[PDB]
Amino acid sequence: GGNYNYLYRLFRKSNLKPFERDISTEIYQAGSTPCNGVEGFNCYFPLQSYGFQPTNGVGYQPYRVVVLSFELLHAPATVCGPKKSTNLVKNKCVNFNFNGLTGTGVLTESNKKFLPFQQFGRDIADTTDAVRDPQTLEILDITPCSFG
């Protein structure tokens, strides 16, 4: 029977700027004489419907289209991709990264209590000595691995 509910404009005076949009449909005059806002000669409807049928040849098939258009410029990015999370050991001098905090040492279960917006703890003389695991939200102490 067919799907003729999908249409396209086929007339305009000029081309488009990138991602311009027009929904306004008016009787497209090539007459040079005004035609009352009514149809007829050299004033035509600017839109055209698609004539679809299941027995159409290849290329005459409905192809659903999606495009991507990205934003960067200045300001602080709002979007972000995914993230990997191997696993957390314990009691094995390790090389760790906690969402930005890069370090080395032995990780151990803690018994301190941060406030529920604090990520890591610091010592006097300003060295990172505790962190909070982002996924499970538990505090872990960071001790250096042995030297001497």
Partner: antibody
Framework: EVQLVESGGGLIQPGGSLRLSCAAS????????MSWVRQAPGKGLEWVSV???????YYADSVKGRFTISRDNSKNTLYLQMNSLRAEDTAVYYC???????????WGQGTLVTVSS | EIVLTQSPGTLSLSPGERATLSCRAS???????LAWYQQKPGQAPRLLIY???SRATGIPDRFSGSGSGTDFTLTISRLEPEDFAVYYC?????????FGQGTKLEIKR
């Protein structure tokens, strides 16, 4: 809607160049498509080129790199400038008003393109 | 492939009778995206019918085109003698607009 007179063609030696003119009348020649079509004198009808109302042009593959179309909507005059003329492009040519589906509804009068000989 | 091929290529008849002819493609075309044309010799060729369904203005109704796919016909219901000319089929379904070669219509006085 009385329109599409043609002029300009005739005797021309090969290797030259010619701009043809098809003037129309009583019509907004800017806000539509026009086209060009040849007619070999022993053979059928073969499409040459099209313009858009936005202004985009297309050509046949044989006339690629050779033939340039243009128009002046201030004087309503289509211009077919053909260059690097070979001795097989010897047809009579027709300007044609174009609609929509690329039907050539209104037709010109014709003018002879004859290569040197 | 898109090549328009006439059925007979010429028809010599007597006026007042139903004329029928077709044009054959070289593949099945997307739906009814073709047309017909006629050519008066020494004159400009003229419109016949768009979309193989309905013809435009300036043309009376003695004429009818039908078909679907590869086959596509044209029927004139009664032979007007002054309509004797060379008649063309034209497509616009494919990415070029190809043509045929014509059909001669006349009488055998």
């Amino acid at each position: 809607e009385v329109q599409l007179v043609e002029s300009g063609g005739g005797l021309i030696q090969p290797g030259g160049s010619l701009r043809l003119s098809c003037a129309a009348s009583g019509f907004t020649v800017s806000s539509n498509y026009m086209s060009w079509v040849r007619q070999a004198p022993g053979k059928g009808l073969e499409w040459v080129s099209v313009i858009y109302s936005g202004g985009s042009t297309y050509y046949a593959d044989s006339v690629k790199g050779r033939f340039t179309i243009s128009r002046d909507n201030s004087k309503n005059t289509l211009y077919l400038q053909m260059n690097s003329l070979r001795a097989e492009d010897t047809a009579v040519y027709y300007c044609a008003r174009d609609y929509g589906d690329f039907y050539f509804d209104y037709w010109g009068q014709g003018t002879l393109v004859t290569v040197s000989s | 492939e898109i090549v328009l091929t006439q059925s007979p290529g010429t028809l010599s008849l007597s006026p007042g009778e139903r004329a029928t002819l077709s044009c054959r493609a070289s593949q099945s075309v997307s739906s009814s995206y073709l047309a017909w044309y006629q050519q008066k010799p020494g004159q400009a060729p003229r419109l016949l019918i768009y979309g193989a369904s309905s013809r435009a203005t300036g043309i009376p109704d003695r004429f009818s085109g039908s078909g679907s796919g590869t086959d596509f016909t044209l029927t004139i219901s009664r032979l007007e003698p002054e309509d004797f000319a060379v008649y063309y089929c034209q497509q616009y379904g494919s990415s070029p607009r190809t043509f045929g070669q014509g059909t001669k219509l006349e009488i055998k006085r």
